[PDB]
């Protein structure tokens, strides 16, 4: 049972800007997704300070980076707070309408695309490098869901049948054919050292057979 939704017009506009603007500095997508993972880990940590049972779904707070050259996918996994179904539908838990407005007024004032994360819509930078993005998420108060979009104005949401997650979010980037550099170990390491070197959670870069 798959539900198909239209993006709000402003978010479709944001996505088509990201996909169609000539902008060579695409590597910042990974900084932005790791930053969102760190924000999600901070949230479940804060809730656990007054209610330790919030970690019954998983005590370890970490980020995994999983490249898969056979599938041409880069997956960013975190064990943060996750998202409910309602969060997923409501622009993956972001204030994306007003964030997109503020971003586009910043661009008019001399900002560039790399500042997207300052406006709360850094998730959508995934579309710098991915043709399709799948988000699998589990929040303590809801069931496990899969969101998916290849842009083009719509996204889908379905109950996830896959491997149970416990709690957190998995972003699966189905990379564009010309963006496979982001599956190479040395390139990922370079980007994490350049842009994410002070993130307060362990990051494990998986290797491949
Ligand atoms: O966990 C990390 N830092 O806390 C690493 C350090 C370098 C090599 C791996 C990939 C980049 C982050 C792991």
Numbering used by the authors: 16 to 224
Any passages from the paper?
Heat-shock protein 90 (HSP90) is a highly active molecular chaperone that plays a crucial role in cellular function. It facilitates the folding, assembly and stability of various oncogenic proteins, particularly kinases and transcription factors involved in regulating tumor growth and maintenance signaling pathways. The N-terminal domain is highly conserved in HSP90 homologs and contains an ATP-binding motif that belongs to the GHKL superfamily. This ATP-binding site is essential for the ATPase activity of HSP90, which is necessary for its functional cycle and for binding client proteins.
In this paper, high-diffraction-resolution crystals of the N-terminal domain of human HSP90α were employed in crystallographic fragment screening to discover binding fragments and binding sites. A diverse library of 800 structurally distinct fragments was screened, yielding 91 starting points for the fragment-based drug design of new HSP90α N-terminal inhibitors. Finally, the optimized crystals were fully grown after being incubated at 4°C for 3–5 days in crystallization buffer containing 22% PEG 4000. They remained stable after soaking for 6 h in crystallization droplets with added compounds at a final concentration of 25 mM. A total of 948 data sets covering 768 compounds were obtained, of which 738 were utilized in PanDDA analysis to identify hit compounds. These crystals belonged to space group I222 and exhibited diffraction to an average resolution of 1.79 Å. One HSP90N monomer was identified in the asymmetric unit. Electron density was observed for residues 6–310, with only five residues missing at the N-terminus and one residue missing at the C-terminus.
